[model samples]
Target: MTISVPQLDCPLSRPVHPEGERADAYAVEWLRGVGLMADEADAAPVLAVGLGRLAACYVDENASWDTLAFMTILLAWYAEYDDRAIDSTGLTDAEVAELHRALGEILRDRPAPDPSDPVQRGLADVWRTLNGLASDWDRAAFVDTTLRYFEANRYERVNIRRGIPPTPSAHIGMRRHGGHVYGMYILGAAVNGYRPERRVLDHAAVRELETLAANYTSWANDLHSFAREHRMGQVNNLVWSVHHHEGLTFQQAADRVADLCDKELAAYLELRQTLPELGIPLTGATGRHVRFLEDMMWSMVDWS
Candidate 1:
């Protein structure tokens, strides 16, 4: 059966960073430095897909080139590394948990990742670089978000190996972690060098904004990646989740998810307006974070 992909009802647009080529060049070298890639030749295909441009677009104009380079390298590493987690079929639940633990320890300033494993090597490098720039609060929050994303991917793979089909709400809950564009808020905070106050970031409204924005990008990803995932006989995607739960055709599910994604976008927009109304001024780091997230929304859309 042929499946039609749905366009997002709301489109958010932003300017592309002017330093894509320069940043990409650095990304290739960094990927190799971390052993995530063999050389520039190994990075050709991924580079063509614009990891550096993604980093550039995900950040604001105030970010320095080094900040842009950090983001570029991080995304590039994910490009190389994510497939292993996604394609983890033969790994046992225990095996996945051990790796997850190792990764968690790394984030806690321990070195439990395999010294020779490129994926862990790359993640460790990202952590080191991030630590140099990130505050204690932002850095620790990054750990939390990264671990959330890490555990979700591990669980998804375990369930896939075990033939556990997720329900719609279960899929929604997991995908938000799996698809925070790999910790959307923290990545932006790292690049922009802005961390909201603990109180402000923890506010109900701010947390909702994070979840809503995360869900919109994630499910939108479901819309596009479904065809490829379906080809692979994957059943964990939201599109598949919806079809499985509701008995809709895949095409119908695609349309349904598109509508769902639009609602998330709308919710994010509405929630954002509340901060100003509540007299929580959107200035300094708070302002930068809000703007970076909005930019990231469109960047993820366009990246897809």
Candidate 2:
């Protein structure tokens, strides 16, 4: 199973989560308690990725220990849905379609998913867990962001079904479509104890900054994950898209993806410095939100 993975060449490395080991240990039991990690088949792999560590880095160091663990479970369940519902062969297209509806219904209407189905049940479980701690506003914002993420992922799944890989141009636009970070960004802010006021968070410049960070993080991930996703016949990977679209070798395509990540990192950094010039105060509440967002971007580099 060995394959060549391109060196990311990022200047930084993964930070210690401080609570990494404890959160990871807690994540396993919590996932099992919620019935998310029951399948021995992929449980190890699913939990082995150390999302608790990633979440620890994504949130603030000042957060309550419980907040770090909660963020870990947030990411773990997010990933498990991808594993059990999207990537697994056990769930047919029809079944996934049903789970999809159930998730939407559960998120929107504040009802439990079908208790009988594991995917649906898991979604409800996490929603309740976070709802218990999150503010009404935070919960509402998370839901709106998550719903858009779901809509985007469904469209990407359409491309997956067509047996066609996206072109580099298309990949640039759709690379963020996988419900991965858009919602998670808000959750990270919520856990960090410093979400912006609605006016600050809703600004166009702030949105651009968040999207820039997401692009860097997601494309970096695509570079690191190309080999695995290629083997799995998942063509949504940016490296594969660039490889097929430009007729480059896998290594060359990975290099391109790395370069793209570096380029975005520069852009995000530059934008971070210039927001104050744009009549957008990068101070106060906005500063707090962006600081965590910046940490998340670099933490993802280490994770990649």
Candidate 3:
């Protein structure tokens, strides 16, 4: 099927660039208003809608998902487990509460996108590939590969059990769980180029993307491992890797992250810029998702 960009309207087009906590409901309402049950074009807005909620909160509200879900859970976990006051990031308790409010509202009643959108299709394709991979590996090998990926690169492969079932583990390495490995497949496909509809692969894109995927996988693994630590207000692996290992300071880490962003994420921005003509809407959660990664530059740069 030829992909074409869809023309979309912003729910808040008439609002005065709504920002802060006040904009939370507006963002959510706009997203929840999208008809995910509709075909692809109508449903395509949901991704942008979900992503927009984050942008409204983060870029506009100066809050983050980390500040909400990750940190809140992490703080309580570490303090209870370690019996120590977590290092305070100098953020006021009210700010933390705001983060929780935003994220909690998200989990309260999430509005899924239309069933016919390409974003979901693309994700489904990825999820299928990961399941295939998990089906191809054994438990020991799975855990071994999991730990090895962590120790070696630091990626977090979550067990995505939503639509796909976990692979059977009885046949040694053949038992697979696709959710955990899907991100790798996605990054690989994006860089190397793969078609979900076609049996044949894009050889030229695959060759170039394989190397890019490896570079990102390495750093992404590192990011995943450090995520909990960062939320707990503990020194992240990036701290140890850059400071102790690379002999660099936080400022240097920020600079290095900028370089990596340029290398790994810049192309995505370029790709997104060209998406609208392909019938991808510049509205709802879709647009916000684009901005989500755009703002992720901060997380990489603000490492402590």
Candidate 4:
């Protein structure tokens, strides 16, 4: 379907600050990129979640600055160098960004996943691992597991409501790692730097990021039952449910960009529930920039 948006007086132009909260600047731009304008009266809360970023892209600019160049390169490396698979390679930055922006628009417009709930906190951590850099072991595991995950868990389980696969390997750690590590690789490359080739992270400034890899996995796995409660019965939850149940699909995979936005926007909103319990108050516009860096990566999905 062709998307259409109307011009506005910049509904989201004035910076959003929900009482004692801060706004995500990059998210604002990301929102603008998706067609959500600053001038709209209904954008305040939606901005809080990143619906604004999706809206921002379509309404204001025909093109978005938070392009997906970095992500395209990383995924190319993954398919070509790591998995020997091919599909979404060599896409332009703008094209990649728009695809992601479209997904973000869907996520934003769907039911909000309860800013007060702390169930699905680590979804992005898995993404970080998949995109950044996988060790030989991690890479092998990811590819092997991803393909299986897609068919057994995603396409069959949630989408078709089947039981888990019978094999032990089908239960591989690929999905968990994809959320934090791979997802970060995509995000980090887009905003931070080229995810080092084969550098499955041992130390440095991204130590916290690596830690996120560990923490998010445990959070998602241990609380799988709890997280299931937050599902909105919409495709938004279904996409994740599909990913966690199976592997990855062009249409059913988790929206890494949306997860990135959730992490940052949650921090920006500074609602106690939104803040990571242990962090030193995760709130600000800076997180939105973080979102842009991450969102610009997944432009090449098969659009299934």
Candidate 5:
């Protein structure tokens, strides 16, 4: 039996950065050489999504071209790498874990895979370049977040193998790490040379805000990819979670996921207002962090 792909319902939009077109053009050329794309055509749509532009929008308009290039390269690589490793691969959880372990070691500056493979070489290049511009703390954060991303991917693979469908909460919990987008937030600071005091960074409210935004983006992704995932029989998507766990039809589950996205978007907006009440000063490094996240929120909302 064939499954019909559902139309995604998203009522959000945001302005793309002025540098978006140029950045995408660069990303296509760079990614193609790195083996992320088979040809120029393959890189087009992913670049058009403006992952680099999204990164640039978060930082100051005058941010360096080097910073924008790093953002584009990493985000573009991720777009291709994730699908190859996770969505498109038939590899087992254990196999994928081993691949990521090698990658983790590389990111942490430990000896790793021979850079003979294109993906490995590409990732190593990114690691070296990013670390060149990163503080010790930034390096640690990027490495840790990347490690968690692999761990969460393994968990999802395990669930899929076992024919286990996650509850919305379980999916969101895993996505907080697995979505692999959160590191961009840290990269935002590094690109802008803005590091909030560790005290400010570790504040409960600040962390909570990050979690909310991550959850929102992850769920929104589930909505956006529902059609393709449904056809692939990928049961880990939030719409599938809702359909099975909530006893809803596919159409109903689609709407339910959209509702959830809207709710999270609302919570994120409300949280933006409460930063002042929480006494989290939106000045200096803190201000930069907030601005980055805020732009990311809108970018995701619109892109979804």
Candidate 6:
């Protein structure tokens, strides 16, 4: 069954980085150095696309090799570990919850599991690098946002186990936290060595824009992953949720979700433009912060 891909036309745009090939090379080597690869002959090929090129493209072009490498390693590790932990590992619901809890503990600086566990090992290595590079606030935001992602993942596992369906609104809100976009914003700040003031980040207007971007990225992921996820019996996607909750055919659901993604992207763009009107000055380090936010959105657009 060849599922037709939807035409996702959104207002978001990505910047080009000529140094992506260099970043890709460094990222692959870094992944190998950290022993983050799965113990399989075909792992490298599958992991190649998850390399840091997208991260490189989205970050400041002047970003250091270390920053690019750090972000790249994160995406690669996340791709592999998420597949193993969530989509295809054949773990039971209880096991999935436990796995998420363990990873959450690691992110929160609790006692980690044995180094032999791949997720724990990768996170520990990445956490150390990020800890050194990011300030206290950046580190806490990353870990706290990540822990929220785990909680959302746990909710998803429970839904899958109980044969329950989440409403479209509930699912979108869940994806806001679970999709890891908020954490990506922090990573972008870390890459640029720009720490936004806690007040600036906590402002209502700022939070609204972040949510808009996160919502757009999260839905875009669902649109892109629809076919593979459907075949794999993953019922957490917007397509499936719409199909079940609205009685639409699968293709109709896909189309509906694609349109929803476009709408969300429009909202994100509109809100971003109105930031200055809301009295948020985009200058100095604040300008850098805005670019990072834009870069994160454009990166997901390009990656999807």
TM of each candidate vs. truth: 0.90, 0.89, 0.28, 0.28, 0.86, 0.88
Give the per-residue lDDT of model 1 (tens digit) for 151-225.
788767865775655899988888877764537677777656677787777778887887787787778777888
lDDT of 6 by residue, 1-304 (tens): 2567686665546666666666666656665566665234354564467566776766666767777777777877777666766666378777766777777778777666666666677788788877776664557777788888878877776666656468888888898876778888887777667777877788898898888777777777787787877776666788879988999887888889888877877777787778888878777666677666666666666776
Candidate 3 structure quality by residue, lDDT tens digits, 56-135? 32233333432232222222221221212122344344543443343223223332133353223322332343344332
**Clash count, predicted structure 4:** 60
Give candidate 3 regions above 4 Å deviation: 1-181, 184-204, 207-228, 231-239, 265-304
Which prediction has the highest lDDT against the true structure? Answer: 1
Ranking by TM-score: 1, 2, 6, 5, 4, 3
TM-score of 4: 0.28
Over 1-304, each residue of candidate 2 has an lDDT whose tens digit, in order, gives 2447666555444456588878877778777777776635454665578888888787666667777877887787887776555432444667667776778788875676578765666677677767666663476766776666666666566666665678887777776757457677777666565667888677788888888988887887777777777766667888878889899888787878888888888888788778888888877878877776677677766776
Deviation of model 3 at 261, angstroms: 1.4
Cα RMSD of predicted structure 1: 2.4
**Residue pairs with backbone overlap in model 6:** none
Off by over 4 Å in 6: 22-40, 47-50, 108-111, 163-165
lDDT (Cα, tens digit) per residue for candidate 5, span 224-292: 777776665566788888888889887888777777777877887788679879888888888878767
User: Candidate 1 has what TM-score?
Assistant: 0.90
lDDT of the structure predicted as candidate 6: 0.72
List model 4 lDDT by residue over 1-304, tens digit each: 0111111111122222122112234334433433333335354544354322332321212222222322322322232211111111333445434433332332233322432211111112223433444222333433443344233322222322322222212332333332334443334433433333333233232334433333333223222322332332212133344455556542323343235323633333343233345442223433443233223221111000
